[PDB]
């Protein structure tokens, strides 16, 4: 509810998330993936963690993979794009090339109306900034898929037991009412 650790994986969109979460009344702290150890995060005492997008892959995302693996089941974690892929890979996921690389287009995904999608319209139009996707047949059994592209891509995953959730699209909203309601869902679990 209070203190959010946002992990910057060197994207401009981490500051959008900063503003969005601050407008929802959260105490947010933004630390770069290479300027942190896991010992650091114990000092900061976060209530929830968010892994940002970034131009890299999870392997090159500094501590992101280490953080998901160590804090899984201790604090809620929300992965956006890169963070969503990092969440799959963390539990033995496989990230593969997409059918079409999307550099800013908005498109309709279907969801299960649970997790961050509770009280959201289905289908839902979202904006995509990615070229890679989580491979469905490789997805670890600990994860349910929660959203699908219309080309049948994984657009959201969620752990079956713990509070860690991913989205492949950029939430980009909080003045959209159904965009505010998506991040508020993570914040007020």
Author numbering: -1 to 187
From the paper:
Here, we chose aminodeoxychorismate synthase (ADCS) from Escherichia coli, which consists of a class I glutaminase subunit (PabA) and a synthase subunit (PabB), to investigate the mechanism of glutaminase catalysis regulation and its impact on overall GAT activity. PabB catalyzes the amination of chorismate (Cho) to 4-amino-4-deoxy-chorismate, which is a committed step in folic acid biosynthesis. GATs comprise minimally a glutaminase that produces ammonia, which reacts with a synthase-bound substrate to yield specific nitrogen-containing products.
Finally, we assessed whether a catalytically competent conformation of the glutaminase active site requires rigidification by the presence of the synthase subunit PabB, by determining an additional crystal structure of the separate PabA subunit. Indeed, a comparison of these structures reveals a significant increase in ordering of the glutaminase active site in the presence of PabB due to reduced conformational variability of several interface PabA loops, which is required to generate a catalytically competent arrangement of the two catalytic triad residues aH168 and aE170. While we found only residual glutaminase activity in separate PabA, the catalytic glutaminase efficiency kcat/KMGln of the ADCS complex in the presence of Mg2+ and Cho was 1.09 ± 0.13 mM−1s−1, which is similar to previously reported data.
